[PDB]
Amino acid sequence: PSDLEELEQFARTFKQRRIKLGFTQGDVGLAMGKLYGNDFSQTTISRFEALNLSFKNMCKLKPLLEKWLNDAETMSVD
Amino acid sequence: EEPSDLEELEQFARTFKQRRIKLGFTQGDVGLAMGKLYGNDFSQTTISRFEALNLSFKNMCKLKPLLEKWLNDAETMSVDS
Amino acid sequence: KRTSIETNVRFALEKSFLANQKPTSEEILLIAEQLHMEKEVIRVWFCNRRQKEKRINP
Amino acid sequence: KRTSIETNVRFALEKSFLANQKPTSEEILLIAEQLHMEKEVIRVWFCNRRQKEKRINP
DNA sequence: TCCTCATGCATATGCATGAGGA
DNA sequence: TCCTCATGCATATGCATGAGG
Ligand SMILES: [Br-]
């Protein structure tokens, strides 16, 4: 609940969830650009999953990656 | 498997790297050009391993002539431009 | 389901390679059982470790 | 366009960071004089090592 | 899937850029 | 005229695949 623990957990769960969907780090960066306008690089995704980014930049990316996960995990659900 | 063959591989690997960088090609650019030049594309990983000799002697010897033709063609296009 | 090797597991697998570079399918199963890993991950690791040893520069 | 550090130069360059994490423009130039790198190669290295220290993980 | 052999996807990261504030 | 900050190109490599013995 500390908010830093919220980012840690979300970053860990994002990795496992990205891998379950069969998406590369680079595919996420591109899908976000087409879906939300600004694309990101495989390097930026990799750093997010490993918490190699500032707490300010980790907070800026979370909601973007959060929206993308909702769309990708419901590809099969009619 | 003579040692002069191993020194020929060392020397050329150094010469290929410096010349690739002088010509302004990425390792990935080489991998793509050869697909168009020889039909068989190669990956950034294989180019990297070649420049550092992270490959078997047998593997090195088969790639050297391929990479050599590409470099020779590139070294004459850059002196014409 | 990606498989990554723990740092200390990698040292253990290296220690066994320096002792025996080519284990049998049975030994692979016992190493995998002792390390609680899929047998193919150990099977492939020993293949790659042999290959890299036959490089001009490992 | 990238310039790469041998390895032992990086250890000495790391030792300088641990001594002074924020050197002045003069110190960076003398650090480069002691090592061999360009003066701007060293300015940026200290920038990134400061950045890396300001991360959640490293 | 048991080996060798040639090869690469996917990833981690060293070095860099540039916009923006002292 | 150096810093901070967000960001990435380029490269190295861990684990893998598949063709063939
Ligand atoms: Br063991």
Residue numbers in the entry:
A (entry chain D): 199 to 276
B (entry chain C): 197 to 277
C (entry chain E), D (entry chain F): 300 to 357
Paper text:
POU-family transcription factors regulate metazoan gene expression via a bipartite DNA-binding domain consisting of two covalently linked helix-turn-helix subdomains, POUS and POUH. POU factors bind as dimers to DNA half-sites to form complexes with a variable quaternary structure. The POU domain combines two helix-turn-helix motifs, a tetra-helical POU-specific subdomain (POUS) and a triple-helical homeodomain (POUH)7 via a linker. OCT2 belongs to Class II of the POU family, which includes OCT1, another archetypal POU factor, and PLA1.
We solved a cocrystal structure of OCT2 bound to an optimized palindromic sequence, 5′-ATGCATATGCAT-3′ known as MORE (“More palindromic Oct factor Recognition Element”),21 which is also a functionally important POU-binding motif in chromatin. The cocrystal structure revealed nonequivalence in the subunits of the OCT2 homodimer, consistent with topologic heterogeneity of the POUX subunits. Despite the dyad symmetry in MORE, however, the asymmetric unit consisted of the OCT2 homodimer bound with the full sequence containing the two inverted octamers, in contrast with the monomer/single octamer seen in asymmetric units of the MORE-bound cocrystals of OCT1,14 Oct6,24 and Brn2.25 The resolved portions of the two OCT2 subunits aligned albeit incompletely with each other and are in good general agreement with their counterparts in the OCT1, Oct6, and Brn2 structures. The DNA termini were also nonequivalent, with one terminus in Watson–Crick base pairing but the other frayed. Nevertheless, the trajectory of the DNA in the OCT2/DNA structure fitted the 2-fold crystallographic symmetry in the other MORE-bound structures. For one POUS subdomain, the closest POUH subdomain was the one in the asymmetric unit, although it was also only ∼5 Å farther from an equivalent POUH subdomain in an adjacent unit. In contrast, the other POUS subdomain was located >10 Å closer to a POUH subdomain in an adjacent asymmetric unit. A model based on nearest neighbors would assign one pair of POUX subdomains axially along the DNA within the same asymmetric unit, as in other MORE-bound structures, while placing the other subunit in a cross-link across adjacent asymmetric units. As OCT2 carries the longest linker among POU factors, other combinations not limited by linker length are also possible. The evidence therefore suggested that the OCT2 adopted mixed linker topologies in the OCT2/MORE crystal lattice.
